[PDB]
């Protein structure tokens, strides 16, 4: 997987970009044939839902594969936890990654206490 | 009902505690203990609101929250709370997440605005949960 | 690390904010605002402790803790913090939950005992993590 | 794992939405929007099962599923799910190809009436860890 | 000329009509999931019919073996049977087969209905002239 | 690549009074890309039950580890029957049955083209 | 215009069938008698397909995939009823085998159409004229 | 020649003789529609059998699958299985058939008589060439 191609397209299109992560099958090595590339980005502002989708399709065209682009600033705590745990950092400072993880893990630990009852009830 | 009423009382108590500690607001901007009290009773308010939301999501199987903000999203999606109220209550969560740490990422102007024109949202939320 | 030094600074400020608000403790049990300010700064000491534990558990690849308590447990298994201190910090998170989410059920006799004696558990943690 | 939790909830949601939309059956054959909803939610149950299956194969290190159907064979081979359950879940993999490609409703109704229990049976064995 | 080209064009026309009939103004759209589900499925049916027309033209005209669903539109653009903007737009729709299922993103669906249905109609008219 | 013997065996073992088996997708042409559909057409004495046909398509799909489209030529359109007669590859059945089916569909498609020509021209501007 | 000529041809053919047929004691034996009605029954079918295909073209209903589809498109778009559509589709088969192919003992079904299903052609041309 | 060819040839032989019985002196023919309806039907049966032969050979010989009856004879002529004049006379025969069955009001009738008297051996020539 051309990670350099990924870093260039996102830097050239996202203003005030801070972090680029590769998650899902590709980050672990479970990357098969009809695989969907998963990318998580964090910038100073939130990316518009339409703008982000169109950008994922730009990466999809250049990579010749379906790409799922996630804006960490607007994604769920569950999704952010999945990125800090399974994800591989492609771009950004070590500091920004650490700061994002500390915020995420704390928020996820708080969410677990809040929704534990809902989790137990569905999982029987 | 037994837990929803308990949380309704804690919100009513905390709203009154904000009003008592803040008062005129003149001394608030300078006294740190006054800020510390208001910050905590605002946190207790939105934490008790999430607690109510999660109880409704549990008894009605509305869904699994993916964030603390998602607790109000599920009630709004299931038309139990009005969309503008859902957005306001989700903004309160944002305040809690920043205010859980030290007062360094401070916005006293945002804290003052919530006390002045946004405490109505917590009361408005109680008024729609009572209609079970 | 820069995140660790920043969080250590947070605990130092909040320990001093508890000592100043409580003072002599003559008006502590009487005044709700003094209780509210002590409880908020205790939570800020707890959160910065949990944040340090979460950071060290991720950076040193000791595991991912899905609870504040598991984060301290993981540090004890990897002998980064002593086990009596781990259980002391875990009991401090316990007090934080009942002090915030169920303030009416809270017994101040335990809070006073923490201010007077157990406020050094944070200082002990601040030094054992400083020795890298 | 959250993948397993959220995918189980998706199946639960989709089954409740199929049962709701279909109802008695009278209105189903005349409204294409109801047909489309039932069809899309069946594909959603199918992919949520494939996703759960792939996650289990990977974590428990059972093997490398070479296809969507193979995700269910690997589970059955490791006696995690019964062969008739596996065989039934594999039957659902062919549903995706029934909607999207015209390629020139009785099957949909048959599935709603008889194969929704296969998805529920799958949730139950996963919940039982 | 082929019954595949005729019928796949007929499918797109029918699916576009059904997308327009269901959506309408968009008021009742964000409330009823039944209306959302219908639009998405008919959008997925448009993507597939286009890819199937692309794959058939690449084989018949002997332009190469498409290495993916997106490469199918690349081979057509390379031989100037479709414009590069049209090719890129039809490729954006290739990613629309994944939005309904692997997710739970209705703003994107609305955007496609309002601004990208024209792409399928553009492709139909381009293929019509043989 | 494609086990035709398995296809013949499974269909013969499940369809009563089976007359013809045809392979007619990308596989019959060799244009069979990866993650392709297997397209099979059958003709038996009686029209197959829709559910029985779909269930059998899935039985073949499990055994062949690929999506399987099974077509009953007795209920298929004239357009679809013409596709099978043109690009199809006969896997089983008598030459008599194939030639009879082929001449029956070519004539029906020719009569159909005469009728729907104006409709086709009208929609293809 | 073409529908009017096609309706006129149907009426002309039904009256032509009734004239040649009349009694049953002259059908099963005479071949010129059989050949006259079999052609005018086909003429009825073909003209019904043409009326259907003109409506399918004008109203943009779809592309027929079979001769039977000409009537299916009408019923799916609520222009004719399902029982009428099903009756007319069953009549296409009569045109298919029993007319342009030598045949054997299909005569018993041909007489059944003459004495009981000539009204289906009449019901169709009355429905189309009505719009 | 296989079964399909044998059975189709037999149909042409039978329908040609059938036209001959219905066309004796041919005086009462131009006045009676019943006699015209039998001649037109058996001529169509003769036409259809020839299309079926042509369609069968085009598929067997891999010449291509014709979309129309006209294309079937062109395919046979292009690969020299039949002569261009025969292909053209057989295509004229099916063109006559279409007018004779679908547009009876605009049928020449004089050409139909000319076809029975002179051009009826065009079907017979096709039987011999294919044999
Ligand atoms: N329902 C869900 N709940 C939580 N996290 C999810 C969910 N679905 C997907 N994810 C996360 O998103 C990542 C990528 O999604 P997905 O593409 O479905 O998985 P994958 O492992 O990359 N498989 P594939 O792309 O088919 O090869 C997963 O690895 C999870 O971390
Ligand atoms: N709408 C249609 N109308 C008529 N015939 C069709 C239509 N769609 C498909 N067919 C026929 O069915 C065959 C197989 O369909 P399909 O599986 O969609 O294509 P394919 O060529 O096999 N491509 P693939 O399996 O993806 O490699 C085609 O080759 C056509 O003969
Ligand atoms: Mg992926
Ligand atoms: Mg994905
Ligand atoms: Mg195929
Ligand atoms: Mg297919």
What's the main sheet of chain B like?
Answer: none
Proportion in β-strands of chain A: 15-25%
- The secondary-structure class of chain B comes to mainly alpha
Which strands sit side by side, in order, in the main sheet of chain A? 3-2-1-4
Q: How many helices of chain B in DSSP terms?
A: 6
Please estimate the helix content of chain B.
Answer: over 70%
Which two chains share the most extensive interface?
Answer: D-E, 20 and 24 residues
Rg of Cα set of chain A = 15 Å
Percentage of residues in helical conformation of chain A:
40-55%
Oligomer: heterooctamer
Largest sheet of chain A: 4 strands, mixed
Shape of chain A: globular
Which descriptor suits the 3D outline of chain B?
Answer: globular
Could you tell me how far the N terminus lies from the C terminus of chain B, measured between alpha carbons in angstroms?
Answer: 9 Å
Count of all domains of chain A: 1
Termini gap of chain A: 41 Å
The helix/strand order of chain A is HEHEHEHEH
Structural class of chain A: alpha+beta
How many strand units of chain B?
Answer: 0
Radius of gyration of chain B: 15 Å
Order of helices and strands of chain B: HHHHHH
PDB class: toxin
Keywords: a novel Toxin-Antitoxin system, toxin
Assembly: octameric
Entry title: Crystal structure of the toxin-antitoxin with AMP-PNP
What does this structure look like?
Chain D: One of its GO terms (molecular function) is endonuclease activity. Chain D: This is mRNA nuclease HepT. Chain D: Its EC number is 3.1.-.-. Chain D: Keywords: Endonuclease, Hydrolase, Nuclease, Nucleotide-binding, Phosphoprotein, Toxin-antitoxin system. Chain D: Pfam families: HepT-like. Chain F: This is Protein adenylyltransferase MntA. The complex is a heterooctamer, with two copies of chain A and six copies of chain B. Chain A is of the alpha+beta class. Chain A has one domain. Helix content of chain A is 54%, strand content 20%. Chain A contains five helices and four strands. Chain A has helices spanning 3-11, 25-28, 49-63, 77-86, 94-122, and strands at 17-23, 36-43, 66-71, 88-91. Chain A has a four-stranded mixed β-sheet, sandwiched between helices. In chain A, α1 runs antiparallel to α3 (49-63) and α4 packs across α5 (94-122). With 132 residues, chain B is mostly helical. Chain B has one domain (1-132). In chain B, 71% of the residues lie in helices and 0% in strands. Chain B has helices at 2-22, 32-59, 70-77, 83-99, 108-117, 120-129. In chain B, α2 packs across α3 and α3 (70-77) packs antiparallel against α4 (83-99). Chain B starts with a helix and ends with a helix. The chains are: A alpha+beta (124), B mainly alpha (132). Chain D binds chain E through residues 10, 17, 21, 32-34, 36-37, 39-41, 43-44, 47, 51, 99-102, 104, and chain E through 7-8, 11, 18, 22, 33-35, 37-38, 40-42, 44-45, 47-49, 52, 97, 100-102, 104. The structure holds phosphoaminophosphonic acid-adenylate ester (2 copies) and magnesium ion (MG) (4 copies). One phosphoaminophosphonic acid-adenylate ester sits between chains A (23-25, 30, 32, 35-36, 38, 78, 82, 86) and D (2-3, 6-7, 51).
């Amino acid at each position: 997987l051309n990670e350099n191609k990924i870093i260039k397209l996102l830097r050239d299109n996202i203003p005030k970009l801070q972090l680029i992560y590769l998650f899902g099958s590709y980050s672990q090595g479970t990357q098969h044939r009809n695989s969907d590339i998963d990318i998580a980005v964090l910038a100073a502002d939130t990316l518009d839902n339409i703008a982000r989708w169109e950008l994922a399709q730009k990466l999809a065209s250049a990579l010749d594969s379906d790409v799922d682009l996630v804006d960490l600033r607007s994604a769920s705590t569950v999704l952010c936890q999945q990125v800090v745990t399974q994800g591989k950092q492609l771009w950004g400072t070590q500091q920004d990654d650490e700061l994002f993880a500390v915020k995420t893990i704390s928020m996820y630990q708080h969410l677990q206490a809040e929704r534990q009852a809902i989790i137990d009830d569905v999982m029987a | 009902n037994d837990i929803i009423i308990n949380k309704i009382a804690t919100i009513k108590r905390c709203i009154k505690r904000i009003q008592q500690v803040y008062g005129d607001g003149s001394q608030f901007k300078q006294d740190f203990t006054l800020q510390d009290s208001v910050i905590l009773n605002l946190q207790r308010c939105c934490e008790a609101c999430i607690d109510i939301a999660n109880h409704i999501n549990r008894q009605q199987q509305l869904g699994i929250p993916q964030s603390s903000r998602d607790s109000f999203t599920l009630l709004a999606q299931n038309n139990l709370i009005t969309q503008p109220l859902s957005d306001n209550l989700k903004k309160m969560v944002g305040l809690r997440n920043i205010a859980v740490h030290d007062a360094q990422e401070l916005n006293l102007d945002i804290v003052v605005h919530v006390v002045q024109h946004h405490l109505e949202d917590f009361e408005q939320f109680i008024d729609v949960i009572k209609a079970e």
